[PDB]
């Protein structure tokens, strides 16, 4: 099941069409696309096909051969001489040698080498040498005719007569630019109607190489406005039309049909037995549980998942994620090589040992992203991402905000609250403002294209760092099992509790770094949870008057929705993801999705995830595309329904899949608390969440 | 000193040398009026250089295998390593890359040992002058050239074959103990941040290089230079590479580290010296992003006597403030102000206002940090020089006691002592 | 032992690398920072910063006393109370004025100008 079969059949059809005409006609072929990589490269395979059809194929002209600085005629005659010297005809060999000498004279004459250009007193007979160059067409024709005759005379048992000589110039995709121009002319002048020349270039390299020469050939025409680029491009157009008829040019395998096919077909192209199993690991025998018909496009994401526990397929397709997957077959093979096992995380065993390898796969994928993300980056974005990496754990948000604002400004000249945080502390940015600014930039009456992919890559980098920090925290789960227990005691029914939480935080630097990344809010602090009109009148503000009058379970309504302790004045944290001690008669703003990122609740969830082995997994804020899903959620007596959505409704949504569990809880302790309510007074989970 | 295979190796070496000469337009083919037929063989040696090189390396491996005694084992492959490519005359490495593409791509195991994106930039330097008229007429952009380079390097070195190691991130994240063990298992840092050898058992080797840097600048300069505001980009000083880390340890190993023993009196004299040494180290580190205004400013600030320095610092910081105003405040109203009317509180106030200005960022923050560090160094140096000459004014202390324990002679005496 | 001044090495390296990086700098692929970092690490490896020794700029030159400099030329040289150069002992000399204000005090006594 050769994968370029159609192209090979078309080549053979072209060769068929031209074989009928034998009157010294111009016939050339131009192969374009990704004809390369491991062992099914179209060029060698085509050469072999031509060999068994009685076409004599010159040894492939590689960039190594072209780097010799010899013209294609010199290469061809050297190959002819070597071929005839390989064996030891007489009658035709001597004529072949005479024509070779004549061609070498013509080459020397063109090089202004002969005595004609170096003698004061020209003689008559050297004028013959000049003729050898002015009649080079006939000499070359006779040379190739006699070469074919000599080759036919070395065939044993009278196999068959050779049809024609074929010259292939491989790996022309990148040969010193102007050099290929020198090649083209050489083919136009000496080997146009002499052989079957196969070019094997890419896209519009020929046109650009011709333009590079003609433009310096047309300075004074272009600057005086006599001609424009259109005239030069038309010249090149008709030249290439005559050199290679557009019915003789064959494209193959760009990115479109590369991404559209199935992973199974590509793996078969490498070997019939290779496949991908249900854990997106590369399999060999049969499995019968394999998933080989997913197409490379979404196989890419489904297989990044199961290795990084990150669903990186964006809800918004404006983000140009397809700029990562493969771009060519070589990149596809190399991606498979980098990404084949990396200790793929499966759905077996006790769902505990897959965390250590997961952060490693995160690092490897970050390296792969950096390799991919090194082309369109110019200077500001390499700089920004580099500084963002080594931004400790808390200056990164400030840098990201100001970088995104730099993008915002680049379209403002041609007020908004998310745009009013430049004279803002690094500890007053959080992650919700980053996402809010990226959305506002996604909806700005300005620049596009590159900006969208910059936003996507920033989201990917943030997700990678968040997952890495979360997994580092999970590795050090023992150090704070106790606080989980305490948290249970603390809001199952003060100040030592906060003290303990801070002590436990200090002993795990990774937990610090994670909580500092998501300072206190991964959702925009503007978000409308009620899609009925505007945002609110006084909906998101509370008072919290005094402890002696707070109702039961009030500690829950301080760490679930109430991530700040301020009146709602310069050097102020304003967020304090730690347990909060609120004063009397003060307005406080509510954020419905703060539970997952509070220190005590996060560590409760971490210990629950590591210790308990059932079927649920606590929700962890490790992916910003989770925020993409969150902003898309409906959320709609009013407060109760929104709270239930936070607790139960939220748990598009395939980005919450996780490699460790089937479903996702929000905070298991809310279940136990619900139990106590039953004492004081899917259906069961719904009723408790209510 | 084989015979059977050496002669073939020599023949292939001669063929390769011919091919090289032919590529150099050296042979008689390019210098003779009247070409002969057999020199066309020499051209072939260059048009078939791949096969000649393959045979050469095959026979070289055979000859090397024939010199093994006691039949140890057969050689697997030939490996070529090109070290210290991080900085080789730019375009020269391009000439190397092509040479590897043309002659040694599928012949050996080539190890490149370069840094970051040096290869891409070196290729671009050549392709850009190769694509003048394409770029200026708008036919192509940098993206096309970068894609060309991208796929070329993808084929030359598969991205599964490239290995990075030890940038600054994991360099700063590890512990000082691990690095010192990387130098020698017995080296460590004691509780006074001095380098120890035996065991101590009071050592602090798990502090990480990041804050070990500051904790060890302290105990030598008596200066806590870790900034409360992390916007200030102090991490631009600590190390940047392992070589810089080793050299920092070399410069900063004892410098008569000030301990918590004895009578806390003799550590002042060495403290100002360590201040000077650290100022030198800062100047060495702080010589890259500085362009012309800041070298100038800091130089003048040094030799600003002892009182024009504040004026210079204020006007330099105001220069930074202005560079973002076009795109009233009281701290900004001191340019037509005497040098003796600036003080140090206005310098700090202006640096804070610049830290909170709706304008430029990045470099400005680190400039503020370095100015603060320089001021702290000068203040500590002057304070310690004063402390050295403490006897000369013991009497005034006593007088001060008498003076506000309960006039005009008192002021007179204070001025004389000053 | 190199015996150069200030940042001559960095500037000399930049003069070469900049013409080595025309098309990188004009197309915005790199800035002066990259070239300066290259030079920085090259010079860091060539001469460790623990191996470089500075001496006697203008700061400590102006801070010392005229007597110390004159002793650096010859132990007996000094400056008298009229700011004239003396040799024997005077015992009325003023050698501890520092070069900074000795400069002005000695322009005075010759031009009658403070």
Author numbering:
A (entry chain F): 28 to 115, 119 to 444, 457 to 535, 556 to 630, 645 to 712, 718 to 732, 745 to 774, 786 to 794
B (entry chain G): 115, 119 to 444, 457 to 535, 556 to 567
C (entry chain C): 228 to 341
Manuscript excerpt for this entry:
The RADAR system comprises two genes, rdrA that encodes a protein with an ATPase domain, and rdrB, encoding a predicted adenosine deaminase domain protein. Here, we determine cryo-EM structures of the RADAR defense complex, revealing RdrA as a heptameric, two-layered AAA+ ATPase and RdrB as a dodecameric, hollow complex with twelve surface-exposed deaminase active sites. RdrA and RdrB join to form a giant assembly up to 10 MDa, with RdrA docked as a funnel over the RdrB active site. Our results define ATP mononucleotide deamination as a determinant of RADAR immunity and reveal supramolecular assembly of a nucleotide-modifying machine as a mechanism of anti-phage defense.
To better understand the RdrA C-terminal domain, we next determined a 2.5 Å cryo-EM structure of the divergent (<20% amino acid identity) RdrA from Streptococcus suis. S. suis RdrA adopts a similar two-layered heptameric architecture confirming conservation of the C-terminal α-helical lobe despite high sequence variability. Interestingly, S. suis RdrA particles existed primarily as 14-mer complexes with the RdrA stacked head-to-tail. In this conformation, although the ATPase domains are highly similar (RMSD 2.7 Å), the final four α helices of the RdrA C terminus undergo a dramatic ∼120° reorientation relative to the E. coli RdrA structure and flip out to form a protein-protein binding interface.
